[PDB]
Amino acid sequence: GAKKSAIGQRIVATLPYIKQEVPIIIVFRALGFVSDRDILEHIIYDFEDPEMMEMVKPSLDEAFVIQEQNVALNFIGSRGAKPGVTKEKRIKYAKEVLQKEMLPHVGVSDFCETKKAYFLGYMVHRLLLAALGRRELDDRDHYGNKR
Amino acid sequence: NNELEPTPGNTLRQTFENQVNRILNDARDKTGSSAQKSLSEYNNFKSMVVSGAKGSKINISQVIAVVGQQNVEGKRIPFGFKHRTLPHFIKDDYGPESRGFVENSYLAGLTPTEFFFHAMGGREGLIDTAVKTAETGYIQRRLIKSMESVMVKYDATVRNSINQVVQLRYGEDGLAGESVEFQNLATLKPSN
Amino acid sequence: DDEEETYRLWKIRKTIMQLCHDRGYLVTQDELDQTLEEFKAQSGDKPSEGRPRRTDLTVLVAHNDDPTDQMFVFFPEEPKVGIKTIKVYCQRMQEENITRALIVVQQGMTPSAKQSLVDMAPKYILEQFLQQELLINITEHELVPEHVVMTKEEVTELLARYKLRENQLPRIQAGDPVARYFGIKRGQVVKIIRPSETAGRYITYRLVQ
Amino acid sequence: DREVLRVIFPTGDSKVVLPCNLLRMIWNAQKIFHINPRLPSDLHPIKVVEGVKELSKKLVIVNGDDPLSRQAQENATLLFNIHLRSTLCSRRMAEEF
Amino acid sequence: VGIRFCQECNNMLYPKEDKENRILLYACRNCDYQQEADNSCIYVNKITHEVDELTQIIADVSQDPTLPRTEDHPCQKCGHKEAVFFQSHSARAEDAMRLYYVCTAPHCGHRWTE
Amino acid sequence: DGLKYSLATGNWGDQKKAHQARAGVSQVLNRLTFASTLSHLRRLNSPIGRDGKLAKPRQLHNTLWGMVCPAETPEGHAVGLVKNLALMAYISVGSQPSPILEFLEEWSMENLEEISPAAIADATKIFVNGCWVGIHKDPEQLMNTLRKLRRQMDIIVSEVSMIRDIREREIRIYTDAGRICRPLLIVEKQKLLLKKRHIDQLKEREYNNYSWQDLVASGVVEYIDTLEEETVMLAMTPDDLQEKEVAYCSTYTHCEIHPSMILGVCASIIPFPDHNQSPRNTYQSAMGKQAMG
Amino acid sequence: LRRNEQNGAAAHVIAEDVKLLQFHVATMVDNELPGLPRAMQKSGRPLK
Amino acid sequence: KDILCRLEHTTLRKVTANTAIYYDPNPQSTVVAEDQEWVNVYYEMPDFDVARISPWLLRVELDRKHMTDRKLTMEQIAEKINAGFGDDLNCIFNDDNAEKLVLRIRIMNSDENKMDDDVFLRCIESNMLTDMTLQGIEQISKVYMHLPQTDNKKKIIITEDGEFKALQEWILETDGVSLMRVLSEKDVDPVRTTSNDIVEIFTVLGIEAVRKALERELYHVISFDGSYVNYRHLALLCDTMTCRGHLMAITRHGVNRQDTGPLMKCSFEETVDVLMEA
DNA sequence: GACAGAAAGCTCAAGTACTTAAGCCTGGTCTTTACTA
RNA sequence: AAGACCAGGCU
DNA sequence: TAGTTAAGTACTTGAGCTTTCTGTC
Ligand SMILES: [Zn+2]
Ligand SMILES: [Zn+2]
In sequence order, the 6+-apart residues with CB closer than 8 A to the CB of B42 are none
DSSP secondary structure code for residue C182 in this structure: T
| Helix %, strand %, coil % of chain H (to 5) | 40, 15, 40
Nearest Cα residue to B172 out of C154, D80, C160: D80
H236 CA to centre of own chain: 36
3-class secondary structure, C203 = strand
CA distance G22 to C84: 57
CA distance F255 to F5: 47
Residue F273 identity (one-letter amino acid):
P
* Burial class of residue B42, CB neighbours in 10 A (0-12, 13-18, 19+): exposed
DSSP secondary structure code for residue H10 in this structure: B
Cα three-residue angle H8-H11-H16, rounded to 5 degrees? 125
Q: In this structure, are residues A27 and A13 in contact, taking their beta carbons and an 8 Å threshold?
A: yes
E75 alpha carbon to ligand 2 midpoint, in Å? 4
CA distance H201 to H216: 13
In sequence order, the 6+-apart residues with CB closer than 8 A to the CB of C92 are none
Question: With left for phi above 0 and alpha for psi between -120 and 50, is residue C200 left, alpha or beta?
Answer: left
Q: Which of residues 167-186 of B touch strand J (CB under 7 A)?
A: none
Q: Roughly what angle, to the nearest 10 degrees, separates helices A36-43 and A113-132? A: 60
Q: In this structure, are residues E25 and H118 in contact, taking their beta carbons and an 8 Å threshold?
A: no
Q: Which of residues 39-58 of F touch strand I (CB under 7 A)?
A: 51
Q: What are phi and psi of C203, to 5 degrees?
A: -110, 125
Nearest Cα residue to E1 out of A124, A62, H22: H22
Report the DSSP beta bridge partners of residue H41: none
Q: What are phi and psi of F172, to 5 degrees?
A: -115, 135
Q: Is the dihedral of CA B16, B21, B23, B24 positive or negative?
A: positive
Q: Which CATH superfamily is domain C137-209 in?
A: RPB5-like RNA polymerase subunit (3.90.940.20)
Q: Does H257 show up as a binding residue in the annotation?
A: yes
State the Rg of chain E over Cα: 22
Q: In this structure, are residues F15 and F5 in contact, taking their beta carbons and an 8 Å threshold?
A: yes
What residue spans define the domains of chain C? Answer: 1-136, 137-209
Nearest Cα residue to H192 out of D5, D10, D3: D10
DSSP β-ladder status, C108-109 and C80-81: parallel
Residue H56 identity (one-letter amino acid):
W
Please give, rounded to a whole number of angstroms, the shortest distance from the CA of B85 to a CA of chain F. Answer: 7
**Ligand closest to CA E109:** 2
DSSP β-ladder status, C202-208 and C171-172: parallel
DSSP β-ladder status, F90-91 and F110-111: unpaired
**Nucleotide with smallest C1' distance to residue B134 CA:** I22
Nearest Cα residue to H92 out of H135, H51, H127, H48: H48
CA distance A137 to C35: 61
Contact D18 B188 (CB under 8 A): no
CA distance D23 to D17: 14
Q: What are phi and psi of F54, to 5 degrees?
A: -60, 120
CA distance F128 to F115: 18
DSSP β-ladder status, H102-107 and H56-62: antiparallel
Q: In this structure, are residues H181 and H9 in contact, taking their beta carbons and an 8 Å threshold?
A: no
In sequence order, the 6+-apart residues with CB closer than 8 A to the CB of F272 are B109
Q: Is the dihedral of CA C168, C172, C174, C178 positive or negative?
A: negative
CA of G46 to C1' of J1 (A): 19
CA distance F90 to F86: 9
Nucleotides of J under 7 A from a protein CB: 3, 5-11
Beta-carbon count within 10 A of D94 CB: 13
Q: Which residue of G has its CA nearest to F14?
A: G44
A45 alpha carbon to ligand 1 midpoint, in Å? 22
> Does D17 lie at the interface with H, CB-CB under 8 angstroms?
yes
In sequence order, the 6+-apart residues with CB closer than 8 A to the CB of C204 are B168, C170, C191, C192, C194, H208
Q: Which residue of E has its CA nearest to H63?
A: E48
Q: What are phi and psi of C126, to 5 degrees?
A: -115, 140
Q: In this structure, are residues E98 and F264 in contact, taking their beta carbons and an 8 Å threshold?
A: no
Which of chain B's residues have a Cβ under 8 Å away from the Cβ of C164? 165
3-class secondary structure, H21 = strand
Contact E61 F167 (CB under 8 A): yes
3-class secondary structure, C115 = helix
User: In the CATH scheme, what is the code of domain C1-136?
Assistant: 3.40.1340.10
Dihedral of the alpha carbons of B155, B161, B166, B172, in degrees to the nearest 10: -50
| Residue length of chain D | 97
CA distance C180 to H203: 12
DSSP run (H or E) holding D85: helix D67-87
CA distance F71 to B145: 41
Q: In this structure, are residues B84 and B98 in contact, taking their beta carbons and an 8 Å threshold?
A: yes
CA of C75 to C1' of K21 (A): 31
Q: In this structure, are residues F243 and F263 in contact, taking their beta carbons and an 8 Å threshold?
A: no
CA distance C173 to C179: 8
Strands (E) across B28-107 are located at: 68-69, 71-72, 75-76, 101-102
DSSP secondary structure code for residue F12 in this structure: B
Interface of H with B in 145-174 (CB under 8 A): 145, 161-164
Q: What are phi and psi of H10, to 5 degrees?
A: -135, 115
DSSP β-ladder status, A22-23 and B75-76: unpaired
Residue F69: C-alpha distances to residues F60, F65, F72 (Å)? 10, 8, 6
Residue F218 identity (one-letter amino acid):
S
DSSP β-ladder status, B71-72 and B151-152: unpaired
Residue H150: C-alpha distances to residues B138, C23, E50, H191 (Å)? 34, 39, 41, 19
In sequence order, the 6+-apart residues with CB closer than 8 A to the CB of H103 are H59, H60, H62, H74, H77, H78, H91, H92, H93, H94
CATH 3.90.1150.10 fits A1-147, yes or no: no
A80 CA to centre of own chain: 16
**Nucleotide with smallest C1' distance to residue F11 CA:** J5
CA distance E92 to E89: 9
Contact E66 F166 (CB under 8 A): no
CA distance H157 to H160: 10
Q: Does F15 show up as a binding residue in the annotation?
A: yes
Q: How many CA atoms lie within 13 A of F166 on its CB side?
A: 17
CA distance C190 to H227: 37
CA distance D21 to D6: 22
3-class secondary structure, C146 = strand
Question: With left for phi above 0 and alpha for psi between -120 and 50, is residue B181 left, alpha or beta?
Answer: beta
DSSP run (H or E) holding C117: helix C111-119
Resolution (A): 2.7
CA distance H90 to H109: 7
E21 alpha carbon to ligand 1 midpoint, in Å? 22
CA distance F214 to F202: 10
A49 alpha carbon to ligand 2 midpoint, in Å? 26
Q: Best mutation site among B89, B126, B129, B132 for testing chain F: the one with the most F CBs within 10 Å? A: B126
F32 alpha carbon to ligand 2 midpoint, in Å? 66
CA of H85 to C1' of K17 (A): 21
CA distance E58 to E54: 8
CA distance C73 to C102: 5
First vs last Cα of chain E: how many Å apart?
Answer: 29
Q: In this structure, are residues B17 and E112 in contact, taking their beta carbons and an 8 Å threshold?
A: no
> Does B92 lie at the interface with A, CB-CB under 8 angstroms?
no
3-class secondary structure, F237 = coil
Dihedral of the alpha carbons of G18, G19, G23, G26, in degrees to the nearest 10: 60
In sequence order, the 6+-apart residues with CB closer than 8 A to the CB of H116 are none
CA distance H102 to H261: 71
> HEC profile for E5-59?
ECCCCCCECEEEECCCCCCEEEECCCCCCEEECCCCEEEEECCCCCCCHHHCCCH
Nearest Cα residue to C200 out of B160, H222, B171, A78: B171
What are the counts of helices (DSSP H) followed by strands (DSSP E) for chain G? 2, 0
E48 CA to centre of own chain: 16
Q: In this structure, are residues C144 and H205 in contact, taking their beta carbons and an 8 Å threshold?
A: yes
CA distance F138 to F143: 9
Q: Which residue of B has its CA nearest to A138?
A: B82
Nearest Cα residue to B23 out of B101, B87, B78, B92: B101
Cα three-residue angle B30-B32-B38, rounded to 5 degrees? 105
In sequence order, the 6+-apart residues with CB closer than 8 A to the CB of C152 are none
First vs last Cα of chain H: how many Å apart?
Answer: 60
The answer to whether H220 CB sits below 7 Å from nucleic acid chain K is no
Strands (E) across chain B are located at: 68-69, 71-72, 75-76, 101-102, 151-152, 158-159, 165-167, 181-184
Report the DSSP beta bridge partners of residue C206: C190
CA of G32 to C1' of J6 (A): 26
CA distance H107 to H87: 9
Which of chain F's residues have a Cβ under 8 Å away from the Cβ of E60? 139, 166, 169
Cβ contacts of A67-74, under 8 Å, gap ≥ 24: A67/A29, A67/A34, A67/E30, A68/A29, A68/A34, A69/A29, A69/A30, A69/A32, A69/A34, A72/A26, A72/A27, A72/A29, A72/A30, A73/A30
Cα three-residue angle H22-H26-H32, rounded to 5 degrees? 45
Cα three-residue angle D2-D5-D11, rounded to 5 degrees? 120
Dihedral of the alpha carbons of B126, B129, B131, B136, in degrees to the nearest 10: 170
Q: Select from E68, E95, E114 the Cβ nearest to the Cβ of B92.
A: E68
* Domains in chain E with CATH codes: 1-45 (no CATH), 46-114 (2.20.25.10)
Q: In this structure, are residues F64 and F225 in contact, taking their beta carbons and an 8 Å threshold?
A: no
3-class secondary structure, F120 = coil
Q: What are phi and psi of H197, to 5 degrees?
A: -80, 135
